[PDB]
Symmetry: C2
Subunit: 242 residues, 2 copies
């Protein structure tokens, strides 16, 4: 209700990680990520680390992996669902060719305006069409207007986790055959490994249940082939078969 | 030569995981890997788990990830350095198109012949050219023979870990611009995160030092872009820039 509102300090999982030690994660970041991180990504990460919802920020080592994937598959047109301050968005725009185009959807443009000066300084604002909306209505409108030639090469889904299964039903039609859909956080701090997990914030417990259901659904879905990857907070890559 | 025993039972790190939870790794395998693992991959894995050198077997979740990379980048010609019983080789052969081609190099053909019946039942043996040799003389001969039009799309390096840096100097010339080189085990059970790590077999300590040196070298190498991925025992994806 009325008060000071939602704080990430109310959340039980903010200090969890899927790797064995903080020392290993820190080693990966210092050895293999920070020396390869664009200066504007560094700046955007450092301001977002001070933001009240910093727990949502995509991991920097995951960012370099998404960039690698985009280049290896020669992605040109992508969609991002869940922008926040724009780290994965800027990662994607930097990875695409000069003529690459991104459709970026988030309910809260004020987060995006935190990253926008870094995006602009990186010279890649022209690649981004930002839509301030709930993603589901936008995706449903796209299904009525987009033609086969307009299909996306790549989708990154990092928005409200309980809705991933709903996003999936749209994105297997909006991503081209052979294209990729990447769902972020599908290991949810390791909590998905347990049928019951004590002491979670109600929103954290909802996401544990939804990800346990989503992970089973994707593994059974004959429209895609999958790879769940233990990077960041876990992600699942889906490649559309038909 | 004469010295101390170096069988798998002599190693210290065999049971150590880079993920913090045995339950989490089991969850990934049971939920997202086994339901998507080819029947002949399952059979090949089950035999290899009983083998004298089972610690060297590539992780099954890493297998699905390598398959996804191969499909997303439309790889057609690849090279594997380090075959063992052939799990990553069969993964690769199943991923490639019908007319794909793999050059597979290993010093020990008897290991490969353990997995060969599974590769044959999968119907993809025809894609594989197995070369029984140390890899370095083969790569040096390839440098003298390979034309630009025959450069490999993809290279998987999983053989003798101290030699990775030597393999790299050849493979950045044998893989096409924009092609990928994947080095396996670059987190080495997490021991790379520490300047000193007590309790290791001398060969385990040698790999810890070599990977710490390799991880710095790749992070600084202008010929490639990199992504180190905390999957399996860690891997580093390199994409050749020029
Ligand atoms: N229904 C919805 N539709 C679109 N965006 C939503 C949404 N519900 C939540 N979001 C947004 O999804 C974002 C999740 S955080 C995303 C992190 C970002 N991709 C990064 O790289 O760091 C938040 O910004 C939130 O505002
Ligand atoms: N110098 C060398 N040249 C080529 N292969 C070598 C080598 N030294 C060791 N090897 C081989 O490298 C292999 C490493 S284990 C490889 C694992 C396999 N790729 C999998 O998917 O499970 C062993 O089979 C070993 O025989
Ligand atoms: Mg996320
Ligand atoms: Mg290996």
């Amino acid at each position: 209700g009325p008060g000071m509102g939602a704080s990430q300090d109310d959340y039980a999982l903010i200090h969890k990680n899927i790797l064995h030690s903080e020392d290993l994660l820190k080693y990966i970041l210092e050895t293999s990520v920070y020396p390869r991180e664009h200066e504007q990504l560094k700046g955007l990460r450092e301001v977002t680390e001070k933001h009240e919802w910093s727990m949502a920020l995509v991991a920097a080592d995951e960012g370099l992996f998404l960039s690698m994937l985009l280049k290896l598959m020669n992605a040109k047109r992508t969609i991002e669902i869940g922008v926040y301050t724009g780290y994965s968005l800027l990662t994607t725009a930097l990875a695409l060719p000069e003529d690459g185009k991104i459709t970026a959807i988030d309910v809260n443009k004020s987060y995006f305006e935190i990253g926008l000066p870094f995006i602009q300084k990186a010279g890649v604002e022209h690649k981004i069409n930002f839509i301030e909306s709930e993603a589901l209505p936008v995706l449903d409108q796209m299904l009525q207007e987009m033609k086969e030639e307009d299909l996306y090469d790549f989708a990154f889904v990092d928005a409200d986790k309980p809705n991933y299964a709903n996003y999936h039903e749209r994105l297997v039609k909006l991503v081209r055959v052979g294209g990729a859909i990447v769902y972020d956080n599908t290991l949810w701090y390791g909590t998905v490994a347990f049928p019951e997990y004590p002491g979670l914030h109600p929103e954290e417990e909802e996401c544990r249940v939804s990800f346990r259901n989503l992970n089973k659904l994707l593994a059974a879905d004959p429209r895609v082939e999958i790879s769940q990857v233990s990077i960041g907070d876990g992600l699942t890559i889906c490649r559309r078969l038909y």
